[PDB]
């Protein structure tokens, strides 16, 4: 009875079940029959917002001086940086890249 489907905060490789990595963490090495899934911190300016078996953390969005933009909220390992424009310019949508 190798399990068909695993548990909520765990994935399946081959015959065996493994914890996911936590938000703020990337997969390094899959779980063994002895040790559990080896994860790692995202570090300075990347983020990953989810229980994940991902090999790289995503890059904090670039909040771009020369498209009318600055850092609204600093990103962190769980979150992503959030972008908002400079003043008399209102943002062209929620996601906020263009500005008049």
């Amino acid at each position: 009875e190798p399990p068909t489907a695993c548990r909520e905060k765990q994935y399946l490789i081959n015959s065996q079940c493994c914890s996911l990595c936590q938000p703020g963490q990337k997969l390094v090495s899959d779980c063994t029959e002895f040790t559990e899934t080896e994860c790692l911190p995202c570090g300075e300016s990347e983020f990953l917002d989810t229980w994940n078996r991902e090999t790289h953390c995503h890059q904090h969005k670039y909040c771009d001086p020369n498209l009318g933009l600055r850092v609204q909220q600093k990103g962190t390992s769980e979150t992503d940086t959030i972008c908002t424009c400079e003043e008399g310019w209102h943002c062209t949508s929620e996601a906020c890249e263009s500005c008049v």
Partner: antibody
Amino acid sequence: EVQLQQSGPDLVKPGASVKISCKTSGYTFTEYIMHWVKQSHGKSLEWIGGIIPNNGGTSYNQKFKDKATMTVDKSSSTGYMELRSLTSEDSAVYYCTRREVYGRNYYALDYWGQGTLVTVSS
Amino acid sequence: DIQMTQTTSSLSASLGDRVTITCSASQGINNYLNWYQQKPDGTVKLLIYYTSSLHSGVPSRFSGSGSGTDYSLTISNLEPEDIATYYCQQYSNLPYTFGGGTKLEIKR
């Protein structure tokens, strides 16, 4: 119920070997790793090692690489462990326990033996 | 080898108090930790696996917190039959290692 029935107590001389026996039931022998743990009188638990029934594959704490040998007999649904080259550092209780191998239980050692007291003496 | 320190060898508390038992690891273990309960007669039972999940029989009184390097077993409403030694074990890295033990007694 699930139960693990280790061998009764053994008195054995220095230099000798002894083999102790975990005998499982209420559960499928091959779906769980047999792990062995030591406890010297009034001390902590030490992990010796684990064995997987289908691979016959093994991990051994280095502290015990030259002491300990785990084996399995898939037919009687029974694990063995065999301590060799005995001295009195080895007089202790030895527990078996199990880890579900597919991962239903994470890395819970969930049901334990009652222990076998090895006493090592002239 | 990851050294697991249960910093309190023993402690006693009145029935119905909350007790917290502490386990720190020589380095981070990303929550990869179980808690065991050895009663005076030497029988060992699992209590809590993956930091905080109760095993089969265990009462609601029991609970595990922790993260990173520092973990806690917590028994709220202490009962006369909670007397045991509590042991934490890590599965982040081999060899699997255990805490020194924390023996819990009743004040009466």
